[PDB]
Write a protein that binds this ligand. Structure first.
Ligand SMILES: O=C(O)c1ccnc(Cl)c1
Lengths: 141, 136
């Protein structure tokens, strides 16, 4: 239960979180979805999970008709406050389309912490340190 | 535990190479310490031997030059706790106005899984047990 663990460590989990959360590939969608659950408070997770509920669930709607890859451009930390700012670029590619869509740049404001939580054998292989996000907001530049 | 995930194993290794193969007079001792914390004494002493004694690398190069690392690719062999990484180094002599020409290398590694200081750098007890670098 330490808010910070090391700039290089904190930087890693956060980048992994965005890529899990903002990228779309039907392969490893479940592990992404699963990971975010472990890497989020219920309040933050509920806001993310909503896109997968009902017959309209993003996985059941798009499937493999399109994809979205993520590229981390920069990472800014506020270590003592458990706050970080990230800029990344998403590029979508629809197989229906001949070429990838124009890029989209974004800014992610995050609150984060690590927590002392008793865990099973499965929850660790994705999140060994109990890293979980407590705030999340995406905006353009 | 025994199993920790691929992208994480990829992380510790690349940053370890950067810790071990990069040269920057600042943070040497911590990096030197960190690599020490991140390594078994037997394989680390091979890394320490070149930094200990009157012949110490830090006392030869000092702050006259630097060497940075750039990761190109990473491949894992999980069940054996073995991994291979490929990187490119660019050296810079402070006296020279520009940077030296690049050189690429391959690192072969073996790996496996506290007070206040040992946790914050490694929380997992991740330790390196073997290390060998070769050219392409
Ligand atoms: O299409 C997206 O960018 C996207 C949106 C919401 N969740 C995921 Cl995993 C991917």
């Amino acid at each position: 239960d330490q808010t910070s663990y090391g700039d290089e460590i904190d930087k890693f989990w956060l980048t992994q979180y965005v890529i899990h959360r903002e990228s779309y590939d039907f392969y490893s969608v479940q592990v992404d979805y699963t990971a975010v659950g472990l890497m989020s408070t219920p309040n933050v997770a509920e806001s993310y999970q909503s896109k997968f509920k009902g017959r309209n669930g993003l996985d059941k709607v798009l499937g493999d008709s399109e994809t979205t890859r993520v590229k981390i451009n920069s990472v800014i930390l506020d270590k003592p406050h458990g706050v970080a700012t990230i800029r990344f670029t998403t590029v979508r590619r629809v197989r229906s389309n001949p070429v990838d869509d124009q890029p989209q740049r974004w800014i992610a404001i995050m609150g984060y912490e690590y927590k002392s939580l008793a865990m099973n054998a499965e929850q660790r292989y994705v999140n060994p340190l109990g890293f979980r996000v407590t705030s999340y907001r995406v905006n353009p530049e």
